[PDB]
Amino acid sequence: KQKALVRVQNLSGSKLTLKTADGKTDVVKDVGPQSHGDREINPVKVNLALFDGSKKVSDLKPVTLARGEVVCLYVTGSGGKLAPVWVKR
16 A cells, blocks of 8 residues: 555543644544544654543654554553553554
C-alpha cells in the first residue's frame, strides 16, 4: 500500500480518540470506548495525542509514518488515568 496502517486500541473503561494537538484534525477515526479503530494514513509526519472526550490527556508528538507500516496505540486504564503506549509492528 501507499499508506501506513494505524490502529488505536482502547484498553480503558472510557471513550478516547487519537488526534492532533495543533487543531481539531484527528488521526484515526472510528474509535470508541472499550474497542479499537483503524485508519490508513499518508506516510508523513503526524502529530499524535491522546484525548478523552474534549480533555487532552497526553501529547505523543509528531511521528514519521512509512508506506506499508503497521502500528498500534495501546491505551490502558489505571487509577482513573490513561497510559498510551505506541507500538510499531
